[PDB]
Amino acid sequence: GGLTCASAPQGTLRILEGPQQSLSGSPLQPIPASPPPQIPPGLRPRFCAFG
Amino acid sequence: AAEELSRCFSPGVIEVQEVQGKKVARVANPRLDTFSREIFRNEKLKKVV
């Protein structure tokens, strides 16, 4: 009436919960790159010679 | 090329007249010139002035 060893298991199942990968879009930056410093339009000379 | 010449100088110095259908640049007032030597960057008009 006691507990005895039974037949060895024939296989093992290991369960884990996993989600999946999306598409590669690689959206690097809101406003991207190093935007260049640049000329103010027209500007004009702010200096003249004497005479 | 008269206008490119007139831009390489303080603007009053080279007065571009219109003698004929073509445009001639003339040295109207040499005194206004500031020495900026910007003609010397032109490579084709550094030989003219």
Swiss-Prot record, chain A:
Annotated spans, Disordered:
18-41
State where composition is biased (Pro residues). 29-41
Which residues are recorded as modified (Phosphoserine)?
26, 34
Query: Which compartment or compartments is the protein found in?
Result: Nucleus, Nucleolus; Chromosome
Superkingdom of this entry's organism? Eukaryota
Name the protein family: Belongs to the eukaryotic RPA34 RNA polymerase subunit family.
Function field: Component of RNA polymerase I (Pol I), a DNA-dependent RNA polymerase which synthesizes ribosomal RNA precursors using the four ribonucleoside triphosphates as substrates. Involved in UBTF-activated transcription, presumably at a step following PIC formation.
Please tell me what else the database record remarks about this protein.
It is in an antisense orientation to and overlaps the gene of the DNA repair enzyme ERCC1. This gene overlap is conserved in mouse, suggesting an important biological function.
How this chain assembles, per its entry, is: Component of the RNA polymerase I (Pol I) complex consisting of 13 subunits: a ten-subunit catalytic core composed of POLR1A/RPA1, POLR1B/RPA2, POLR1C/RPAC1, POLR1D/RPAC2, POLR1H/RPA12, POLR2E/RPABC1, POLR2F/RPABC2, POLR2H/RPABC3, POLR2K/RPABC4 and POLR2L/RPABC5; a mobile stalk subunit POLR1F/RPA43 protruding from the core and additional subunits homologous to general transcription factors POLR1E/RPA49 and POLR1G/RPA34. Forms a heterodimer with POLR1E/RPA49. Part of Pol I pre-initiation complex (PIC), in which Pol I core assembles with RRN3 and promoter-bound UTBF and SL1/TIF-IB complex.
Q: What is this protein called?
A: DNA-directed RNA polymerase I subunit RPA34
Origin organism lineage: Eukaryota, Metazoa, Chordata, Craniata, Vertebrata
User: Gene that codes for this?
Assistant: POLR1G
From Swiss-Prot, chain B:
Q: Which residues of the full protein are shown?
A: 249 to 297 of 346
Effect annotated for changing residue 31 to Q: In TCS3; no effect on localization to the nucleus; no effect on association with RNA polymerase I and RNA polymerase III complexes
Name of the featured protein: DNA-directed RNA polymerases I and III subunit RPAC1
How does this protein assemble? Component of the RNA polymerase I and RNA polymerase III complexes consisting of at least 13 and 17 subunits, respectively. Pol I complex consists of a ten-subunit catalytic core composed of POLR1A/RPA1, POLR1B/RPA2, POLR1C/RPAC1, POLR1D/RPAC2, POLR1H/RPA12, POLR2E/RPABC1, POLR2F/RPABC2, POLR2H/RPABC3, POLR2K/RPABC4 and POLR2L/RPABC5; a mobile stalk subunit POLR1F/RPA43 protruding from the core and additional subunits homologous to general transcription factors POLR1E/RPA49 and POLR1G/RPA34.
Query: Can you tell me which family this protein belongs to?
Result: Belongs to the archaeal Rpo3/eukaryotic RPB3 RNA polymerase subunit family.
Disorder noted: Treacher Collins syndrome 3: A form of Treacher Collins syndrome, a disorder of craniofacial development. Treacher Collins syndrome is characterized by a combination of bilateral downward slanting of the palpebral fissures, colobomas of the lower eyelids with a paucity of eyelashes medial to the defect, hypoplasia of the facial bones, cleft palate, malformation of the external ears, atresia of the external auditory canals, and bilateral conductive hearing loss.
Q: Which domain of life is it from?
A: Eukaryota
What subcellular locations does the record give?
Answer: Nucleus; Nucleus, Nucleolus; Cytoplasm, Cytosol
Q: What does this protein do?
A: DNA-dependent RNA polymerase catalyzes the transcription of DNA into RNA using the four ribonucleoside triphosphates as substrates. Common component of RNA polymerases I and III which synthesize ribosomal RNA precursors and short non-coding RNAs including 5S rRNA, snRNAs, tRNAs and miRNAs, respectively. POLR1C/RPAC1 is part of the polymerase core and may function as a clamp element that moves to open and close the cleft.
